[model samples]
Target: AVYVVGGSGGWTFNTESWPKGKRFRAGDILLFNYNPSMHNVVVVNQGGFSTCNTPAGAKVYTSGRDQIKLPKGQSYFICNFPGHCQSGMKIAVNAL
Candidate 1:
């Protein structure tokens, strides 16, 4: 199954709790919609998620329509563009 992040607001939400109460499974896809020119998605570790840091060799997506395959255990996603992550452009999900 595929879930769209942030509905119509896309990546411009006010909090990282967008996926709250949502159930994710391995192989499910996360569809991130945003402006490619203004925003990007980065798969990061907990440390990176906390600090809004893009680690070396981090996987980044900038196509405006990014599809992320869910993996077992928890995954963290954030925007690495300046203060975007701090402004609530991040999510954490635990896949079954």
Candidate 2:
């Protein structure tokens, strides 16, 4: 299954609210929507999610329609473009 992050508004602000009370499973895909010139998608560790930092060698998706596959565990996504992540542009989802 595919979930559109932030719905019609796309991946904008306060994305953390998008996943609440939702059902996510392994093999599910997350389609992130945003303007490539304004934002980007980065798969980061849990630590990076809190600090809004992207470590070297982390996976980065610059395409506006980035699709990320989820595994069975915790997944952290963020926009490392300036202060984007710190501005509630980060989300944590768990696949069970």
Candidate 3:
């Protein structure tokens, strides 16, 4: 399945409804659409799946469209922008 990840204004993930705990098959692409904010996608190991992390001590912004192919198994997505993930800008995807 495909997913849409919104970006936060600063160091936060967009507080919108994301496809949480969604199941998928192999080769599924996850797309993230950003608003007027700079963002980055990273893989975090401590969360549901792989997490996304933004640059540390730096402001990263991306008001464009990006895509990431899902690997097999569960992964977490997060914005590594300082406190973005801490602010809850994280998502989980499962591949079966």
Candidate 4:
């Protein structure tokens, strides 16, 4: 299954609680929509997600149409531009 992080409004909305009540499983994909020049998606650890830190070696997606494959267990994603994550642009998912 595939889920768009934010619907048509894309990355302009606050997505902190976006995945509540949603089910995720292994092999699912998360699609992030945004302007490449304005925002980016960062795959991070829980610590990085909490602090909105773009740690070295973190996988970054900047194509505006990034697709992330879900693996079993937990995954974290966030926008690493300035205050985006702090303002509710982060999401955590548990893939079963």
Candidate 4 residues 1-96, lDDT tens each? 999887777765478787899999999999989998988988999899888887899998999899899999899998888888888888999999
- Candidate 2, residues 1-96: lDDT per residue as tens digits? 999999999988778889998989999999998999999988999999999989788899998998899999999999988989989998999999
**lDDT (CA) for every model shown?**
0.88, 0.92, 0.57, 0.87
- TM-scores of the models, in the order given: 0.94, 0.96, 0.62, 0.93
Ten contiguous residues with the weakest lDDT in model 3:
47-56
* Candidate maximizing TM-score: 2
Q: Distance (Å) between predicted and true CA of 75, model 2?
A: 0.4
| Winner on TM-score (1 vs 2) | 2
For residue 52, model 2's alpha carbon misses the true position, in angstroms, by: 0.7
Report the CA-based lDDT of candidate 3 relative to the real structure: 0.57
**Which 10 residues in a row give candidate 4 its minimum summed lDDT?**
6-15
Question: Once all C-alphas are superposed, what RMSD does model 3 give against the true structure?
Answer: 5.6
Model 1 alpha-carbon drift over 4 Å, by segment = none
* Candidates ranked by TM-score: 2, 1, 4, 3
Given candidate 2, what's the lDDT at residue 31? Answer: 96
- TM-score of model number 2: 0.96
- In the predicted model 2, the residue pairs found to clash are none
